[PDB]
Design a protein around this ligand. Structure first.
Ligand SMILES: OC[C@H]1O[C@@H](O)[C@@H](O)[C@@H](O)[C@@H]1O
Ligand SMILES: OC[C@H]1O[C@@H](O)[C@@H](O)[C@@H](O)[C@@H]1O
Ligand SMILES: OC[C@H]1O[C@H](O)[C@@H](O)[C@@H](O)[C@@H]1O
Ligand SMILES: OC[C@H]1O[C@H](O)[C@@H](O)[C@@H](O)[C@@H]1O
Lengths: 118, 118
């Protein structure tokens, strides 16, 4: 199982490493970085809503530049939301509806998984 | 070896989990959370300057309340700097001199390991 250091939300400077995850308030939706180096959004520990698999991800960081980035152990980017901007604060939120969202200031969604299935 | 998602410094909302670490600019001083659940500050991968061992630590978080806290996988605190305050921003810095320091605003040291050995 995955440890949850952040509840639902990865704020600026937040980092999820292998074995850690965001978890929805409901408990049903989990955004994991796996020991197998995959970045995966799961419903009910059963349904893979969204993933970046096969790239040896070490961690995901919600950066102070607004970009949300997955890195391998060597610091090479393996995934990014391309959300760079100045509309601070930025947050990555794992929602009860299943959607994983990068919000800019004022609750402005600037990237999402498009997986609001609940 | 330990992945370094933060260089030397754990800012507010920063989290180090098992297998991750802060690293000094010099490369010589590393603040690790181990797979064995220990929180350890090492010089030259050889000399344990400071540690909290035996408590099954899962992660260390530099919190937005100013407190720097080590937690087990169940969210129980196993270590804290007791640095809670309003002098934002707070940062935990792993320095080239060997010292691990919680700084409040303006570079005010409010907690340290007292391990400035280099
Ligand atoms: O796409 C990867 C890179 O994108 C850049 O704009 C920055 O956000 C970097 O921090 C990141 O590593
Ligand atoms: O000592 C443990 C606890 O201390 C409190 O003041 C807070 O900082 C908590 O977040 C923390 O878990
Ligand atoms: O487009 C993003 C938007 O999609 C849905 O409407 C919901 O998941 C919202 O919470 C989210 O902000
Ligand atoms: O007391 C904390 C203080 O100790 C030493 O003087 C150095 O390591 C400083 O960088 C640090 O701020």
């Amino acid at each position: 199982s995955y440890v949850h250091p952040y509840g639902s939300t990865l704020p600026e400077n937040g980092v999820i490493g292998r074995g850690y995850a965001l978890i929805s308030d409901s408990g049903r939706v989990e955004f994991r970085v796996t020991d197998e180096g995959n970045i995966q959004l799961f419903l009910d520990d059963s349904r893979k809503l969204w993933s970046v698999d096969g790239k040896n991800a070490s961690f995901v960081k919600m950066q102070t530049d607004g970009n949300c980035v997955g890195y391998d152990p060597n610091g090479t980017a393996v995934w990014h939301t391309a959300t760079n901007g100045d509309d601070h604060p930025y947050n990555l939120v794992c929602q009860n509806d299943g959607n994983l969202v990068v919000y800019a200031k004022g609750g402005k969604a600037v990237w999402h998984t498009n997986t609001a299935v609940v």
